Amino acid sequence: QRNEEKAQREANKKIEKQLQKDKQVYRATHRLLLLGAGESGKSTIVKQMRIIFETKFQVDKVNFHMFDVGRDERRKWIQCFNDVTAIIFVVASSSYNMVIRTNRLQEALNLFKSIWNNRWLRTISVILFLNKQDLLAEKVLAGKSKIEDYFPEFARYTTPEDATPEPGEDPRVTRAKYFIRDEFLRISTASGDGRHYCYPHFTCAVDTENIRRVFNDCRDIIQRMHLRQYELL
Amino acid sequence: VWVVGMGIVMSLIVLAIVFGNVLVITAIAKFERLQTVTNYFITSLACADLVMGLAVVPFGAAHILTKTWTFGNFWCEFWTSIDVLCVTASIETLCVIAVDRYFAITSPFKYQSLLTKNKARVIILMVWIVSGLTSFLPIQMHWYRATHQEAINCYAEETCCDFFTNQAYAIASSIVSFYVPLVIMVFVYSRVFQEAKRQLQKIDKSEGRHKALKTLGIIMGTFTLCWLPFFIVNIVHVIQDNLIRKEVYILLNWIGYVNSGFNPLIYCRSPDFRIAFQELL
Amino acid sequence: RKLVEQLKMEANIDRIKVSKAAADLMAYCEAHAKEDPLLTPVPASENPFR
Amino acid sequence: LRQEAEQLKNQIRDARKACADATLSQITNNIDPVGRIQMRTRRTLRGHLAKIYAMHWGTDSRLLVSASQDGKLIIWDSYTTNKVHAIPLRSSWVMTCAYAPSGNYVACGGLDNICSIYNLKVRVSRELAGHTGYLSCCRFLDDNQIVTSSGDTTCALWDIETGQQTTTFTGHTGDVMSLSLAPDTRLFVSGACDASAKLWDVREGMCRQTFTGHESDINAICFFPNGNAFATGSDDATCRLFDLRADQELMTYSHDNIICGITSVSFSKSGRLLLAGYDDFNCNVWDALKADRAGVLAGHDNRVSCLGVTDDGMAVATGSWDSFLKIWN
Numbered sequence: 001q002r003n004e005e006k007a008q009r010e011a012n013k014k015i016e017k018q019l020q021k022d023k024q025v026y027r028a029t030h031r032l033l034l035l036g037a038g039e040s041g042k043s044t045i046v047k048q049m050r051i052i053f054e055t056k057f058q059v060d061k062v063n064f065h066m067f068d069v070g071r072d073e074r075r076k077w078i079q080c081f082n083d084v085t086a087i088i089f090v091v092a093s094s095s096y097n098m099v100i101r102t103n104r105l106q107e108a109l110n111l112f113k114s115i116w117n118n119r120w121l122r123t124i125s126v127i128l129f130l131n132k133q134d135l136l137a138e139k140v141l142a143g144k145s146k147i148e149d150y151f152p153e154f155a156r157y158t159t160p161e162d163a164t165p166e167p168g169e170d171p172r173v174t175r176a177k178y179f180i181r182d183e184f185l186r187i188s189t190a191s192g193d194g195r196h197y198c199y200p201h202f203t204c205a206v207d208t209e210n211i212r213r214v215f216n217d218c219r220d221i222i223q224r225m226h227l228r229q230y231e232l233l
Numbered sequence: 234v235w236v237v238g239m240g241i242v243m244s245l246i247v248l249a250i251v252f253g254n255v256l257v258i259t260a261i262a263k264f265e266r267l268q269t270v271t272n273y274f275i276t277s278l279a280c281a282d283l284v285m286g287l288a289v290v291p292f293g294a295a296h297i298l299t300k301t302w303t304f305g306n307f308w309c310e311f312w313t314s315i316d317v318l319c320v321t322a323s324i325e326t327l328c329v330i331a332v333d334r335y336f337a338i339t340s341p342f343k344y345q346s347l348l349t350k351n352k353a354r355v356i357i358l359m360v361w362i363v364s365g366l367t368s369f370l371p372i373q374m375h376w377y378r379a380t381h382q383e384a385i386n387c388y389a390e391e392t393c394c395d396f397f398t399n400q401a402y403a404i405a406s407s408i409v410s411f412y413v414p415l416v417i418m419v420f421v422y423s424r425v426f427q428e429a430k431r432q433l434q435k436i437d438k439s440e441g442r443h444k445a446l447k448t449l450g451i452i453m454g455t456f457t458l459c460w461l462p463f464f465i466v467n468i469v470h471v472i473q474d475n476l477i478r479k480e481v482y483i484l485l486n487w488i489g490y491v492n493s494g495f496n497p498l499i500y501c502r503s504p505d506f507r508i509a510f511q512e513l514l
Numbered sequence: 515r516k517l518v519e520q521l522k523m524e525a526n527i528d529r530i531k532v533s534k535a536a537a538d539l540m541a542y543c544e545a546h547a548k549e550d551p552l553l554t555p556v557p558a559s560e561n562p563f564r
Numbered sequence: 565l566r567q568e569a570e571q572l573k574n575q576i577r578d579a580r581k582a583c584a585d586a587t588l589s590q591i592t593n594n595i596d597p598v599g600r601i602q603m604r605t606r607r608t609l610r611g612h613l614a615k616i617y618a619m620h621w622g623t624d625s626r627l628l629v630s631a632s633q634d635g636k637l638i639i640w641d642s643y644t645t646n647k648v649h650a651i652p653l654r655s656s657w658v659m660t661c662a663y664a665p666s667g668n669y670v671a672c673g674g675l676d677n678i679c680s681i682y683n684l685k686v687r688v689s690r691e692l693a694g695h696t697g698y699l700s701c702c703r704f705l706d707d708n709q710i711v712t713s714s715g716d717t718t719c720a721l722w723d724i725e726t727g728q729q730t731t732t733f734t735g736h737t738g739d740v741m742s743l744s745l746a747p748d749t750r751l752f753v754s755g756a757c758d759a760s761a762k763l764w765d766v767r768e769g770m771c772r773q774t775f776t777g778h779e780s781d782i783n784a785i786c787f788f789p790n791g792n793a794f795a796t797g798s799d800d801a802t803c804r805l806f807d808l809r810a811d812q813e814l815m816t817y818s819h820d821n822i823i824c825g826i827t828s829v830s831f832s833k834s835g836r837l838l839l840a841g842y843d844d845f846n847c848n849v850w851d852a853l854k855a856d857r858a859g860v861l862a863g864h865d866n867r868v869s870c871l872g873v874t875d876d877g878m879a880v881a882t883g884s885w886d887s888f889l890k891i892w893n
């Protein structure tokens with residue numbers, strides 16, 4: 001009879017109301033993906049931000065969710081993360097001399113190239129973190145590992161006068177850090193059509209203000225996305 | 234033969250307005266990918282422009298060409314009310330679209346929660362309700378009629394039907410319809426331009442190794458140069474001026490009408506809209 | 515290691531001529547063609563959806 | 565060492581070449597073409613929040629299951645378009661879903677590496693864990709056994725009550741992306757990123773045959789209704805139909821226009837029509853015997869992710885990243 005149809009309609013209405021509530025709850029949550037090598041220091045960034053691994057943290061009453069897929073040389077699940085606001089990329093800038101066999105930093109640059117020139121994620125910005133700044137400073141000041149020996153581009157590289165360095169009190173460490181950042185920026189600029197941007201941040205394990213950096217940067221990402229959607233940028 | 238040649242312009246304007254608005258309405262209606270929060274406002278604006286282009290443009294053109302109004306007095310009042318309602322709704326929808334854009338850009342994190350489908354429907358219903366009030370209530374109740382002998386004679390005559398209004402109603406209609414939305418649009422677009430300039434400066438600083446100005450300029454120009462002269466002549470001839478000839482007033486009103494053939498194609502320039510238009514035709 | 519044994523096991527298997535299997539597939543498609551509403555659309559009365 | 569492997573490869577290649585007498589094109593060239601086919605969206609469900617990945621028609625030709633990145637596994641009645649059940653998932657990502665032939669159980673799993681199983685008579689009756697990599701596909705052999713394909717390049721045969729891997733089908737290079745079951749529960753095949761589709765026996769647990777025709781990753785596999793053949797979609801534009809008895813390839817379905825890959829492949833009830841999803845917004849059909857495309861299907865807003873043909877053959881349902889299942893007939 002029609003009693004079964006009426007019961008099914010009532011159940012459908014209840015499920016639709018629950019789905020509307022879930023949509024309201026979920027549309028305000030922003031998804032972030034944490035990507036990096038095992039020795040990069042993603043655990044340190046996760047600990048700093050919190051204070052598959054699912055993490056809830058909110059800034060200014062805005063809920064962000066962070067994912068950590070964690071060998072997987074052929075990344076086939078990278079197409080699953082297509083609705084995330086930004087992808088957090090963590091690389092140890094002090095790992096230029098250490099090589100496993102091809103420097104680890106060069107392998108991270110190749111991974112960044114693969115992520116950037118990905119067909120499935122072409123509107124997904126990348127938040128770049130360079131951990132182990134203190135270790136990089138110690139390595140550069142010591143001079144045991146010549147930066148030009150592993151990266152030949154350092155021989156002709158000059159420090160950027162446009163960017164004011166932090167008070168590191170050493171021109172050499174600033175030059176090395178800015179060269180490492182400029183490598184990623186040069187990879188990002190080649191395919192940059194304005195849809196997605198790469199934001200380099202120099203961070204340290206002692207530093208804990210990375211959460212505000214992520215919040216502000218995600219705000220800028222959404223603002224740029226809206227501006228390009230309305231064709232004002 | 235001048236009117237015969239002139240009549241072609243009005244026919245072309247009406248055809249263009251109807252075709253553009255129908256195409257836009259079909260574009261949003263047919264494809265579910267186009268439906269969105271702001272596309273509801275866009276389709277409301279398209280509906281208002283279509284209504285005005287269908288109703289008041291042909292009737293006004295016929296009145297101008299024949300130099301007389303064949304239909305009845307009640308139908309003339311209905312035509313005037315429809316004209317006011319459509320103009321007010323169109324400009325208010327422009328203002329609402331500008332406010333939505335400003336809220337989406339300046340406050341992106343809260344933008345998803347601030348406006349939803351229910352919120353957009355409520356806003357559209359409120360806009361149409363206030364437009365319908367401001368149009369019909371002062372007209373159908375004869376609150377806009379003037380005490381001058383010329384206005385009384387014009388109302389008494391069955392054939393001739395021109396627009397005669399009080400200073401108070403003209404001022405109120407102007408401020409409700411155009412002036413307040415003009416202020417709101419200018420403010421929100423100035424804020425949006427400031428945000429865009431800040432973002433461009435930040436991007437230049439970060440990756441040193443415009444378009445926003447052009448878009449805001451074309452939007453503000455096609456709104457202002459189309460409506461502002463008419464809505465300043467409104468107050469001018471309402472308040473202590475007789476130099477405003479009827480021809481100038483009608484010409485500026487028809488420029489305002491022509492704005493309805495310009496709003497769609499500038500508000501549907503997105504690549505998705507172009508793809509939908511290509512698929513439809 | 516075990517890959518050599520796996521390939522050796524895979525090598526020794528009975529096979530039939532491709533023509534025979536092709537004819538079998540064609541015969542199956544011809545025989546079961548009638549009992550398929552996808553090839554021949556169902557009448558609106560018979561169609562459960564419409 | 566590798567000399568024995570090379571000799572075996574040469575022997576199998578020679579055997580396959582010898583067994584290839586006449587291509588199926590030569591035999592089929594004297595058949596009547598299917599002709600143009602018109603497919604219309606009988607019903608649009610449109611109840612999902614985010615992009616959906618997989619769907620599975622129930623044993624009855626009505627009920628549906630579709631899983632989306634929103635984390636909700638929703639059961640749909642195709643005829644009435646009403647939502648029967650909505651089962652939230654503990655894992656935010658679900659890469660696959662399944663419907664048991666009895667209809668009592670529904671299983672889904674994703675990047676959590678756990679094949680969650682829900683009881684419909686919606687609580688988690690059992691959660692199966694033990695896969696190193698992300699899950700990719702799950703199918704029900706019966707009411708008590710399920711085969712899951714994981715990113716650890718291994719597929720396993722599970723027991724619901726026992727909760728442990730009864731048999732592990734190790735010995736595959738790339739990560740398996742899809743699997744299909746024979747009309748009987750005896751045989752099932754899987755395709756991985758190693759450009760190889762291998763046939764497996766559930767009882768013995770050894771790969772009987774290995775087909776490596778493709779040059780790219782396989783993303784979708786379905787059986788011919790006979791059970792003697794199966795077609796594999798791929799990242800390469802070509803979709804190929806293999807043959808278990810002939811041990812070799814039979815056809816490739818390639819067109820000049822299509823530069824995209826394949827996401828879902830499914831046959832018709834009679835086996836004459838091969839339905840293949842695409843990375844392009846629209847799906848394509850293929851005459852399984854003539855290799856000539858019959859008619860392009862209406863596209864979604866985004867890329868399609870799953871194809872399912874009813875057991876009765878009445879309708880086919882396609883789900884894209886636009887969170888829409890459009891029932892076609």
Ligand SMILES: CN[C@@H]1CCc2c(ccc(O)c2O)[C@H]1O
Nearest residue numbers: 313316317320396406407410486
């Ligand atoms: C047909 N002429 C009308 C008369 C006055 C008027 C117009 C438009 C908008 C308004 O707010 C008005 O008060 C004109 O289109």
